[PDB]
Symmetry: C4
Subunit: 262 residues, 4 copies
């Protein structure tokens, strides 16, 4: 309505060639893993995965390889994985096939999505144990209002594609899904937006848990939550919100910063 | 016994001091983790010469890397950047400009989105005088008891400014904390202290049923520890600690 | 093919050098997590591969953050005397570890560190529920030691703990803290790391409300999938590597092969 | 009881000269402040104070000066303060006179005590709001069992009242305020402070999570005797001192 004008926010970049787009994505992919490591989302052993669709090779995805610590990962460590077979088509190492099954099915169900993020975190795990939608407790939780789901089954590791299919079906067109008794998944039209939604979702889980422990807080009414969610929950806002996180992660590691593509 | 805020002979010297302190305060807040909030956080500092214009951190610049040269000067009425190229967060700026207009005594307004501040703000409740450290807020802060989404209309900023009255802080319910100060330093101390007090209150409420300090004691304590002089002085080691962490920024310190 | 396998060594000397290096790095990993703040309380023992009933240990009072392979001491199981090195072990903690080692010839390493979440959860004298997938490795595979008699200054109290542990991967010493074991140091250190985080999650969820646990039959299946030695060993690898990357100086002490 | 023999633990050092003793104490004092800064106990503005009695000059105390951040302090920044007047007798800067009044009265009441520590912390502040003794919830809390008090009022006369309530104990909880510990050495005092804050953290979390069971008094008292002596506190602090040194090579070089 009285939202800022067209030129207020920065726009996601567009690239001439697939190779230029790919170099940009692999760098942002590595930086996002460094950002998540610094938040402590790298402690979960082999559980964490970020997939980014290759712009040129349909139905193949860049991924962090099994067991590589997020804190040291570089673009050259990323592997490209075939969606259907989960086989590595570029690189030597394998992906986490269970996590990858979930991601590939989400990617297949969501052609609009460039990136899927699933990391095992403390606040995310704890909140997921309630099998409950994230309430619109504060303005910052409103981007998820009427735009996330709870996957209300838990059948162990997703070793059958059918489990991935069921998760993707429950996600529908939403930005996030809570795997009950498991943890958070976010998606985005860009890696940047996906990584912002993940960061924000974990912080919202933290806030909700603490407020519930401390007393009986009041949530924002639906009508205001929905308005606020429209204001703050768009791809453009998510992409823009991620930028200082990317930049801050660069400033922290001069070595990674030097690998930024021309 | 206490140090006094400095006096300057020229606007240029005063301005350079303010911009340096402004950037260091952002580095202090980044180190506390208050830089995780995307585009939400804002600190405004009145320019000492140019009435009704305010230095601000620009939209999307990470607090951890910001320098004086990154700060933008923004016109209070239009929210237009009049010095620098980048834009301010116009929603947050609407709140700050209205508070500045309502409070000629205030040099600085701070609003950052934090975990403890967000959580506590969800209760729409004044911060109790639970410990000595919470007493600076006792009978000196308000709750803004409305939430209508982003503050995109100056009128909503006006309402917040009206509710703040002469107080040092206001809790925007279901949103987060705002503090003010006669100096940037005092404002940044109040913000730091308020977040810690929110943390302590939430933990104590979760753990059981704690007892507050009685109002009579709280008010006396609050007078002792809630003055501008105390707030300004309390901030000094925080400024210095932030400097020690970045030698590069430390070299940009004016004389 | 998919998972890596623990290494096999041709000589006791090569095995030993590998273990001491991994032992030091594990202590660096735990320091970084803040599990080094407990004064003298924390202990990791690693069985020597050649010398029966003797154990490498971190020495009393050496900070985890600076420890190197050369600082580790080898301790006799029965006497708790240092047989290699100069310094003494924490004899109370060692009594527990020696008895567990004696009871569990399959175990290479025993880990006991005093942590905030571990201590807090241990105050409830309660098994760790299968609240999330990550807690399932402990499902039907850990015990609670349901006595607390002070420092373990008698072998007999170590015996009681070892008896209650049975064949499990972990035991919660009530009003005290966590102990994990493993067929390798790596797996033991992964179980400890994971156990502490699971204690954290359980405490927060119980504080926040009334969460629902995974049903037993699903928990048991998940626990078999994620609770094997192979999975534990593999899960630890990025933690070892991340600790190395943090200290180039320690990283240079890595043995070859 | 079944406790280790004579030579098992290291002993606090003895010096032949006050000059050597003093240089040792000032170095340890600076390092302890670095240790506490790293724990985040430096966030509390002007609130935090560590006093260390000078070994030679009666009723005078080394202190961190008002408003110097803990993270950067060196031995040369410490000031020596007269107990009675709170005047700086060595150095230029002033101490926090309010906090110092509490410390000086504690020192006066406790000739056995070398060091008094009062820092404002999150878990300490929160737990102190309950005006309740720290229960023997885990082994680690047992050093405080029957060896700490709650000051059941609101903050020289105030210092006197605190010192009276502390009696011969290692710690006192200032209700609705925060923690104080003391020690026969700086090292032991700093260990008790570190440990006390962690114990407050554990107690708060366990009380939030449900209804935990404490160690019975008889076992708590035995455990407290095993782990709550000066010797054990001194020894427990040593890795914390050494770890703090390893973190700052620059401070490490100032070691006497
Ligand atoms: C067995 C396998 C293919 C992968 C291992 C693995 C997967 C996951 C997960 O997807 O949640 C979590 C932890 C973990 O270790
Ligand atoms: C639409 C717009 C002007 C600004 C962005 C923006 C503002 C705020 C806020 O003021 O609370 C929080 C997050 C955020 O992204
Ligand atoms: C008296 C003695 C042998 C050892 C010291 C000692 C042991 C323990 C323990 O095992 O839990 C914890 C702390 C500590 O200081
Ligand atoms: C007025 C004065 C001498 C000191 C100020 C001061 C005292 C205290 C305290 O004693 O608890 C805490 C914070 C603080 O800022
Ligand atoms: Fe998973
Ligand atoms: Fe805001
Ligand atoms: Fe122990
Ligand atoms: Fe105080």
């Amino acid at each position: 309505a009285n939202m800022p004008g067209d030129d207020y926010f920065r726009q996601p970049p567009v690239f001439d060639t697939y190779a230029e787009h790919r170099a940009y994505l692999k760098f942002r992919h590595a930086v996002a893993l460094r950002h998540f490591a610094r938040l402590g989302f790298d402690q979960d052993g082999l559980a964490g995965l970020i997939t980014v669709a290759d712009p040129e090779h349909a139905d193949t995805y860049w991924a962090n390889p099994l067991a590589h610590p997020f804190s040291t990962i570089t673009p050259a460590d990323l592997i490209r994985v075939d969606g259907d077979s989960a086989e590595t088509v570029e690189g030597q190492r394998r992906v986490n096939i269970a996590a990858f099954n979930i991601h590939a099915e989400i990617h297949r169900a969501r052609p609009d999505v460039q990136a899927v993020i699933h990391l095992h975190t403390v606040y995310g795990r704890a909140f997921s144990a309630f099998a409950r939608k994230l309430p619109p407790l504060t303005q910052d939780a409103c981007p998820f209002f009427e735009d996330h789901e709870v996957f209300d089954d838990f059948t162990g590791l997703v070793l059958a594609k059918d489990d991935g299919r069921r998760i993707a079906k429950q996600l529908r067109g939403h930005k996030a899904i809570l795997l009950k008794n498991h943890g958070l998944v976010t998606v985005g039209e860009t890696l940047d937006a996906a990584a912002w939604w993940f960061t924000l979702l974990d912080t919202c889980c933290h806030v909700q848990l603490l407020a519930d422990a401390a007393g009986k807080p009041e949530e924002i009414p639906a009508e205001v939550a929905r308005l606020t969610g429209r204001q703050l929950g768009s791809h453009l806002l998510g992409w823009n919100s991620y930028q200082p996180l990317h930049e801050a992660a660069l400033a922290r590691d001069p070595d990674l910063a030097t690998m930024e593509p021309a």
